[PDB]
A and B are shown apart, each in its own frame.
Chain A
Amino acid sequence: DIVITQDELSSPVTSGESVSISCRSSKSLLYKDGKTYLNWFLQRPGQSPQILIYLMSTRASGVSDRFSGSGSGTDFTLEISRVKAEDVGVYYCQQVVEYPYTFGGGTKLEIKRTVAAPSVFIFPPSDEQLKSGTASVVCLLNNFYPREAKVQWKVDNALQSGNSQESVTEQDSKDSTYSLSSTLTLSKADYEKHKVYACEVTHQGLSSPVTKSFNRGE
């Protein structure tokens, strides 16, 4: 079988800059007819792969003229001339010169953009959840850049530890931001023993930490 190798990461790029993604095969993909049987796909977050290039350098249907391909028998390059927001995702090369078809491990592309502060939003637990004996408090950081952020929970001004979990979206394909959820989980008993619930966020887009809070039952 042919082994196809790519780099895991591409050095992030700013909108309008060029980028170059490489792929290599353990055997030549140049056939006797002079054509090279290498395809490029882009998989956007949550979606199926979509064809970009076939025969090493032909653009498929509806593929931006910013994409182009080249290479030898065994070394290949996908070139994005003027990168845009919607290019974000994982790029895969695939050889189809022989069965079995084989793919590279994929190259994630992230885009760099201007620093952007999170909008911070806080959500008390639902009465419905409380009835069942747990409280989940949710803090949302919407549409920020870069991805690094710190979210600390304070209950009646005590810093919380070990009772929260975070999750972050992949880079948005229109505005190149991230969003992040922080969920604090308490028993109904513990929730009802305290008053002030606060989410404190530190981020480079913020002069100083923003705190969003509520009082239980307000």
Chain B
Amino acid sequence: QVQLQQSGAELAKPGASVKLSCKASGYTFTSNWMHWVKQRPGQGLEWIGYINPSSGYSKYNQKFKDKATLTADKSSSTAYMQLSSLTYEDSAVYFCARLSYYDYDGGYFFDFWGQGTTLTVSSASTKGPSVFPLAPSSKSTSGGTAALGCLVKDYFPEPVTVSWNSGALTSGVHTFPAVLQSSGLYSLSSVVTVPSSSLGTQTYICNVNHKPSNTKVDKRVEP
């Protein structure tokens, strides 16, 4: 399986630096140039640059030539992007993407992407979430199905991730967009619908990650 896997979300202070990683597996890392892309809401996508991992040479968008520094470690099949002298304008999702070329038609494009890394630049301190059960009950049944979930409250910065039963449960899952509370902290719920029949014999656990605070929790959700 060709895939790119990126480092988890980070908080950094104004003026500091961060170094983001992109591990390549399932192919010879040195064979494909690795590109990086920035994404912010209503700012589309911006191309940052690429590195040739075989040679170590990198090429930049002029706009990022003073911001980004690309490196590659051949032994660990990992590409890195350092972002220097951070500002609020650097808060974004950053992707790595591999370039492929097809000699038969001259076509080249980004064929595989990392899942992205969220970076928030802020002076405020991190805060990990409090995770509460949204318990299934008669007030959450319909037919022979029941809704249950987890409330992920009071964290900073974004994002959290939520899986169910370590990723075994995906159908019916709705993880909502976070909302900013008046407190300056974020909150979100993740919900799933399951067979009401299953509530007695099937365990449901939400697996909550808050990479910017380096915290994780599992919360068992009982009827």
Contact flag A49-B45 (CB < 8 Å), given A100-B61, A136-B151, A168-B177: yes
CB neighbours (8 Å) of A136 from chain B are 132, 151, 153, 187
Contact flag A48-B177 (CB < 8 Å), given A92-B44, A181-B189, A183-B189: no
Q: Whole-angstrom distance between the alpha carbons of A135 and B60 in the complex? A: 50
CB neighbours (8 Å) of B47 from chain A are 100-103
B216 touches A (CB below 8 Å):
no
CB neighbours (8 Å) of B42 from chain A are 105
Q: Whole-angstrom distance between the alpha carbons of A179 and B174 in the complex? A: 8
CB neighbours (8 Å) of B115 from chain A are 47-48
B151-A212 in contact (CB<8A): no
Segment 174-201 of B: residues with Cβ below 8 Å from A: 174, 176-179, 181, 187-189, 191, 193
A187 touches B (CB below 8 Å):
no
Q: Is the interface of A mostly helix, strand, loop or mixed?
A: strand
CB neighbours (8 Å) of A167 from chain B are 176-179, 188-189
B113-A50 in contact (CB<8A): yes
CB neighbours (8 Å) of A47 from chain B are 115
Q: Whole-angstrom distance between the alpha carbons of A169 and B172 in the complex? A: 13
B44-A51 in contact (CB<8A): no
B73 touches A (CB below 8 Å):
no
Q: Whole-angstrom distance between the alpha carbons of A101 and B105 in the complex? A: 20
A122-B140 in contact (CB<8A): yes
A55-B151 in contact (CB<8A): no
Q: Whole-angstrom distance between the alpha carbons of A100 and B60 in the complex? A: 8
Q: Whole-angstrom distance between the alpha carbons of A106 and B44 in the complex? A: 6
| Residues 33-72 of chain A, each 1 if its beta carbon lies under 8 Å from chain B, else 0 | 1010001010000011111001100101100000000000
B-side interface residues toward A, CB under 8 Å?
Answer: 35, 42, 44-47, 59, 61-63, 95, 97, 105-111, 113-116, 130, 132-135, 139-140, 142, 147, 149, 151, 153, 174, 176-179, 181, 187-189, 191, 193
What are some 6 contacts across the A-B interface (CB < 8 A)? A55-B107, A60-B109, A124-B135, A142-B147, A167-B176, A183-B179
Q: What 9 new A-B contacts, CB under 8 Å, besides A61-B111, A140-B140?
A: A92-B44, A96-B108, A119-B147, A138-B189, A140-B147, A167-B178, A181-B191, A183-B179, A183-B187
